[PDB]
Amino acid sequence: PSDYMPEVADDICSLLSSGESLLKVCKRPGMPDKSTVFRWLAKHEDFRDKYAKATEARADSIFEEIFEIADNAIPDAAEVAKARLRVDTRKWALARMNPRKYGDKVTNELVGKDGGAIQIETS
Amino acid sequence: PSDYMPEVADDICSLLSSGESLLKVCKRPGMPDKSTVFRWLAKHEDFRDKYAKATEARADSIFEEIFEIADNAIPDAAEVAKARLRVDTRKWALARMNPRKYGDKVTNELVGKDGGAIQIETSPMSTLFG
Amino acid sequence: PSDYMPEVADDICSLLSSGESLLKVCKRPGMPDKSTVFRWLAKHEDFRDKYAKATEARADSIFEEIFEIADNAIPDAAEVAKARLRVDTRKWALARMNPRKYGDKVTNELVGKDGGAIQIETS
Amino acid sequence: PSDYMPEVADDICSLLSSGESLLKVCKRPGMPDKSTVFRWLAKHEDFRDKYAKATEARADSIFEEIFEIADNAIPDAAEVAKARLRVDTRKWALARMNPRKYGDKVTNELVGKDGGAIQIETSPMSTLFG
């Protein structure tokens, strides 16, 4: 298959929401390939609407996955290294999937020289 | 368990509040699967609100947990690496769960050229950037 | 036990101050569980007052602990790795327990293009 | 293949869009070498424009790929290190390919001295910095 199909598009948004890579999703019988999906994302606004929201839901699923991957890692050097890579890749991806929710968080206390007021000169 | 059940949702909130992760909670007897929990959240504002409170409590619980994970790690190379991964994952998650409390903390002393005042020159716009 | 008790709350603030994880504190006979303590922290202002101050005192104790953990680490690969994890976890926690005291410290010398004045255009 | 051939350039764009890297594409039967592709880009705006679109698509493809590389890594020390390198290289490249989408994301809560307002003192210029 390679034609637009709302029922499969919906199907796509569903699996995505649960956390599964799009790669692992399109890899199902009767589903559009990855390239086609990205094509649809340019000729269907109704799709780009269900897709971004699906991506934020996917992120929320992945957030809970990282605890499991870490806590259930097999206590062998290479398996722990793999678990770390799986977690690190997810952490990095989460920030991009929902920057407001999963981006880095910093509080910067801004002060001036010697803890006094910030000194500015203007021309 | 597919239909929304407040009593079960309440239990989920209590377990999360204590520091347990969602996927682990969902493995307990009679719990809904994670996908179902997410569906419940989506359609029940009462659950969403209690879940948000549980997440705050969850973070405070995890903050204490990381000390235990580190201090009690089995002194074996792989076990220590696993403990480190568990702690690092929690540290990252805490900042997201409560950014105000658990985000990074930096004090930036801002000075200018040669440790004097910050020098700023303002000029008329030179391109149409408005 | 699971009822409010100022004498045990005080007891809590005490052990906390010396550096001991709350987890290790509530784990004593006759003490409220962790969950209960966090509950009290919502129905007692007199508590939230002794608790935040206890936390800052706890931080000061932990600050001295990291030197000991580092300096007295057993010189074996895994024990040193564990010591490093114990220290790193404490460093990260200290910044959250007292951000003013234990947060990161940076001095930023702000200059403009080529070391000249910072150039701004406004619209 | 030295002369600019649109049909071949179009194929290159499709292959890149799917996530394949340029040097790997150029090893396929009948493809120009990388230096030739760069020469084509330099002198053909039609190719440059389609190549820019292909790069955006390439990034979206790679974003999905990194999950697979990590999750499917052979649990051997060297193979995991290689998978990590492949993922790290892609992460770095993604931010450059589409900075808006794949750049780092930070929220900075800006406060002043002792958690109060940011204190700013302005003064007449003291040196000729204009």
Place this chain on the structure above:
Amino acid sequence: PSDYMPEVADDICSLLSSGESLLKVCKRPGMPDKSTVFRWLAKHEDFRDKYAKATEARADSIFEEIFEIADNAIPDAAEVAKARLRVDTRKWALARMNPRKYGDKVTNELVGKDGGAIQIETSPMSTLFG
């Protein structure tokens, strides 16, 4: 030693000033335990002031110490890792003990779009954020 004893507090300050850590000091003959030292600090402003001066001196002492720890490390994998941990712990602590002297140092050359001026557009508030 439970009661505040100035002579002992003074010795503590001298030992800290030389670079010794508090827990190590408290193991010396006739020293109070750390909890007692903290109690003394809490209730004696004279000790607090001298302790603050000792902390500044302590930092300067540690700054020199880190060179020795690194340079004299036994060239064994575990011993080098331990030396690294001792040095890293001190580096982190120094920045807190005297932020002005031992904090990170960065020069940020600030420029705007395409290396020109920083472009700023100001607009009326669009939401009630005051």
Place this chain on the structure above:
Amino acid sequence: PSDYMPEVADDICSLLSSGESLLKVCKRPGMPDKSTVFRWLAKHEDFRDKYAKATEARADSIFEEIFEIADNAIPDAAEVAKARLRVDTRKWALARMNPRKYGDKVTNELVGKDGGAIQIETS
């Protein structure tokens, strides 16, 4: 050779563009040494023009090289470590060769205390 030569300067800009270190370029028979090239870069504007552009083209070549070095790394500990060093060195260099294109990319959402407006006091 050690005299100015536009045909060799051109030759230089060519090899550079394809990604090859200048070190590896001057190492060809009849070519000026590295030191001489840097000298020319001070007495020929026509050169400093072809050189900076050559450097940006070199960067674009190196960008594609890093994928190959990573993906084709021999799966042996030391070879992977070497591949990582080769890639890391290139990543660092790319940012300097074309900062606009290859520099770090950050989006900073700037907010004030507790997510409110940024609070400023002026004197």
Place this chain on the structure above:
Amino acid sequence: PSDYMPEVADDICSLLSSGESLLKVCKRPGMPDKSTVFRWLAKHEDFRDKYAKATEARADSIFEEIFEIADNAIPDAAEVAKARLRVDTRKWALARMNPRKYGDKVTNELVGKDGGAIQIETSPMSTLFG
């Protein structure tokens, strides 16, 4: 060689310009020791100026060198670690030798609350911070 000798100072500048480090230069036949070079610099502005130019050239030379060190590293664990150290040391040094050219490069897209405008509230000073 203790007395300032311009011919020797000139040679030092040429060698540094080519990428050689000072301590290595000072080991060559007839060279002054490093302490002497520093003394020459301190008291001879002509040498200081030529040395500053040599440092710029040195940096450009090292920038090319790091590619060679990485690419030619012997694929042995210790040799690769040493090559990494040599490259990392040079990267750090380059940024100091020519900050404009070799410093870190970042583009910061600055936005405000919820991706809208940066919200700024100005208020009268509330403490004597002037």
Place this chain on the structure above:
Amino acid sequence: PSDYMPEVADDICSLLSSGESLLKVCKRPGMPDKSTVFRWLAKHEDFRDKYAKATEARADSIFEEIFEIADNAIPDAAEVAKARLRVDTRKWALARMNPRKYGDKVTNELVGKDGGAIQIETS
């Protein structure tokens, strides 16, 4: 010895300038101990003047030392790890000894949403 002595203070500033840790300096026969030196640094301005300048000169010596430590490292795992620690400690220290010269260097291109102008609203 433990009395103020300009000739030894000078002697101190000398060795410091060449790069040698103060610890390694005071460790010479007839020299004040470390603690005494820090005491002098509070009762002699003529000293605090020769000392800060000595520190900047010390930094310049250390800067050249790091190349040697890196390039001449013995190619054994632990020796390379030690060399790395020696270099890292020096790099960190250099930034504190002369922040203007040895601090981190960053160029920040500041732009607004989507590469447009930085958008500000004021109240």
